[PDB]
């Protein structure tokens, strides 16, 4: 029941925005909700880039994410940024 206070939308891409994109693609606000919802030891990330590699969705299917950036410039504005 640690929940964010407020939500804004991204305006330029970032490493943070990329990982937020990948969490929200799989249906989680961020790693805080994803670890709340799922029993998580580690979040599997790419070695060189740190980006999220795979996520188990709410229906227990999995999303896989590319080593390189996936959030194109058109999508940046749709990523939600949550403050705690």
């Amino acid at each position: 029941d640690v929940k964010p206070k407020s939500v804004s939308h991204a305006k330029k891409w970032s490493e943070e925005i990329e990982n937020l994109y990948r969490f929200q693609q799989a249906g989680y606000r961020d790693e805080t909700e994803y670890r709340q919802v799922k029993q998580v030891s580690m979040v599997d990330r790419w070695p060189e880039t740190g980006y999220v590699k795979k996520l188990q969705r709410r229906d227990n299917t999995f999303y896989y994410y590319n080593k390189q950036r996936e959030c194109d410039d058109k999508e940046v504005h749709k990523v939600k940024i949550y403050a705690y």
Binding site: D1, V2, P4, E31, T32, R35, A83, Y84
Partner: protein, 169 residues
């Protein structure tokens, strides 16, 4: 010893060098840029460390990250409860004192951390009964910090787990 593996790993974000001029630690990376979801729990996993090189970089590491974490600390609080519990459950007096000072720092490091800690009192507070009376007064001082920054539900939840607790302020 997940910290011992973290230590001297590649991702370890502190430079392993000692400058004569003090006991500051040199960060290879800026604290602001670290993913606290990954780093802060690893540093808290060092609360169990007592051997010389490790314990220093664990404690000073926790100190700086809490002092400069800001709004990065609250979203990570759930991931710290197991490391806090494990350190305290060693029933080592020195690990418990270091952890208590850290818990004091935790609940003042950022807004709402103290309140968000209340649901976990029953997971971390029990050991302190053994040592409830210098560790006794540090437990008392820590519990007052918890209650002071814990919101309206803090005392009742401190008392459920610490029946002998009492505090005016």
């Amino acid at each position: 010893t997940a910290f011992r593996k973290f230590y001297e790993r590649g991702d370890f974000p502190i430079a392993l060098e000692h400058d004569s001029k003090g006991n500051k630690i040199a960060w290879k990376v800026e604290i602001e840029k670290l993913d606290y979801h990954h780093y802060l729990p690893l540093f808290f996993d060092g609360l169990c460390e007592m051997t010389f090189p490790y314990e220093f970089f664990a404690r000073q590491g926790i100190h700086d990250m809490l002092e400069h974490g800001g709004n990065k600390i609250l979203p990570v609080l759930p991931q710290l409860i197991i490391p806090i519990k494990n350190a305290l459950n060693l029933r080592n007096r020195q690990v418990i004192c270091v952890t208590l000072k850290v818990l004091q720092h935790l609940v003042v490091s950022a807004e709402m951390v103290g309140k968000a800690l209340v649901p976990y009192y029953r997971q971390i507070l029990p050991v302190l009964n053994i040592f409830k009376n210098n560790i006794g007064d540090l437990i008392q001082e820590t519990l007052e910090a918890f209650e002071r920054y814990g919101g309206e539900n803090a005392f009742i939840n401190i008392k459920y787990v610490v029946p002998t607790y009492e505090s005016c302020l």
